[PDB]
Amino acid sequence: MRYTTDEGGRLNNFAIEPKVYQAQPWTPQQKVRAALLVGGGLLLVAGLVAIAVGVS
């Protein structure tokens, strides 16, 4: 992989980074699969402020 540094005959290693890629606008499947998660999130944080009001 990384073969480096002939200063003493030596090695040093570094990361292989993914390529960059501009997003494609979402499909309706991607929209509804995302919708379940955000909707779950909304009610989850509502319920936890509810538990918070109870415990005081």
């Binding site: 993914p18 390529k19 890629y21 501009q22 997003a23």
Partner: protein, 65 residues
């Protein structure tokens, strides 16, 4: 590779891997949360330091009284 059951379940969770929304995005929105946080740190630093006195708060051991 080693085909295994839990690996296949977690497979779609690491599958974007370098994808990015075009240009600046929500940087200007980050900066708003960022600034508020710094101002918060200053408020709670000066209360501790007794440089900001807010009536009804007494910064000493005697608040466990």
């Amino acid at each position: 590779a080693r085909r295994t059951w839990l690996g296949d379940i977690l497979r779609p969770l690491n599958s974007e891997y370098g994808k990015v929304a075009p240009g600046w995005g929500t940087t200007p929105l980050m900066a708003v949360f960022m600034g508020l946080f710094l101002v918060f740190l200053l408020i709670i630093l000066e209360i501790y330091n007794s440089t900001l006195i807010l009536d009804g708060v007494n910064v000493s051991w005697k608040a466990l009284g």
